[PDB]
Amino acid sequence: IIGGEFTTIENQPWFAAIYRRHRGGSVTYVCGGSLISPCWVISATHCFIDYPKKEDYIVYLGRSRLNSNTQGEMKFEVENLILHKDYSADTLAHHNDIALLKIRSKEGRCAQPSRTIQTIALPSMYNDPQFGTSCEITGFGKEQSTDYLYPEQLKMTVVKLISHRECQQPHYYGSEVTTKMLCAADPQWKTDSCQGDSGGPLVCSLQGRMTLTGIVSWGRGCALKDKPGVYTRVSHFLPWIRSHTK
């Protein structure tokens, strides 16, 4: 996250921290995710497509720091890694960038809701917030495009939704951004998601309810003029989510 502010997991209790175990024992941060039910985490397929082996991944809930065992956190293994069958990546645009992770503790149990571990509601079909709506993003991603390290403390920021017709303008993304994607940015281009924030949530308050409207997917640079953050529009994928969580 470029700009914005540091936060803790009690502010974003649906946030999942996803890590990968390498040969030799080293563990590195991969992507963010969101808890949509006790046994299920939703993320982005591009996070796992090059290493699609479920045994490689570690999922944490109730974790606020990149290398601290936050009080009340829960550690899980991936029982089932579900990638979208028609996923593909162009020079910029990522298609069907959505994945599901069935989580299980070493004792065989799913998440236990608490003050730091909570689910996030899914949107209803054909009901996305109007363009201009302010929404929040969360992640352990880069603070600056030139950084190579991720921040130790979890971050958050607020961006505004951008219409499909504006996002399709020639100086924006043209025909590369589709109706299955949602654009969001800062009007002053000072804050945004970046590398490391992928798979994480775009949460919008819609008709009084906190909703998982988007999943961090792609963008040209980070906080670059006329180049919004692009997110998987979760409302389009409700039939796919329901079928694969059964």
Ligand X SMILES: COc1ccc2ccc(C(=N)N)cc2c1-c1cnn(S(C)(=O)=O)c1
d(CA 231, CA 3) in angstroms, rounded, equals 19
d(CA 175, CA 164) in angstroms, rounded, equals 10
- Residues 126-145 close enough to bind ligand X by CB under 6 A: 142, 145
Instruction: Examine residue 67 and tell whether it contacts Na ion (CB under 5 A).
Output: yes
Contact 101/59 with Cβ under 8 angstroms?
yes
Residue nearest ligand X, Cβ-based? 219
d(CA 174, CA 3) in angstroms, rounded, equals 26
- Position 20, amino acid: R
Instruction: Examine residue 43 and tell whether it contacts ligand X (CB under 6 A).
Output: no
Instruction: Examine residue 193 and tell whether it contacts ligand X (CB under 6 A).
Output: yes
Residues 79, 124, 221, 242: which binds ligand X (CB under 6 A)? 221
Look at residue 14 and give the partner it binds from Na ion, ligand X, none, a contact being a CB closer than 5 to 8 Å depending on partner kind: none
C-beta of 144 vs 153, nearer to Na ion: 153
Handedness of CA 4, 5, 6, 7 (dihedral sign): negative
Instruction: Examine residue 166 and tell whether it contacts Na ion (CB under 5 A).
Output: no
Instruction: Examine residue 28 and tell whether it contacts ligand X (CB under 6 A).
Output: no
C-beta of 126 vs 148, nearer to Na ion: 148
Question: Which H or E element spans position 167?
Answer: helix 164-167
Look at residue 124 and give the partner it binds from ligand X, Na ion, none, a contact being a CB closer than 5 to 8 Å depending on partner kind: none
Instruction: Examine residue 113 and tell whether it contacts ligand X (CB under 6 A).
Output: no
Determine the size of the site formed for ligand X (CB under 6 A). 13
d(CA 16, CA 63) in angstroms, rounded, equals 8
Instruction: Examine residue 156 and tell whether it contacts ligand X (CB under 6 A).
Output: no
C-beta of 69 vs 163, nearer to Na ion: 69
- Position 149, amino acid: L
d(CA 121, CA 106) in angstroms, rounded, equals 27
Q: Chain centroid to CA 51: how far?
A: 18
Between the alpha carbon of residue 35 and those of residues 104, 122, 192, the distances in Å are 13, 10, 22
For residue 166, give both structure tokens: 């504006």
- Residues 56-95 close enough to bind ligand X by CB under 6 A: none
d(CA 60, CA 70) in angstroms, rounded, equals 10
C-beta of 76 vs 237, nearer to ligand X: 237
Residues 66, 89, 210, 224: which binds Na ion (CB under 5 A)? 66
Instruction: Examine residue 199 and tell whether it contacts ligand X (CB under 6 A).
Output: no
Shortest reach from residue 65's CB to Na ion, in Å = 4
The DSSP letter of residue 150 is P
Catalytic residues: 46, 97, 198
Shortest reach from residue 140's CB to Na ion, in Å = 9
Query: Which residues in this chain contact ligand X in the complex, by CB under 6 A?
Result: 142, 145, 192-195, 198, 216, 218-219, 221-222, 229
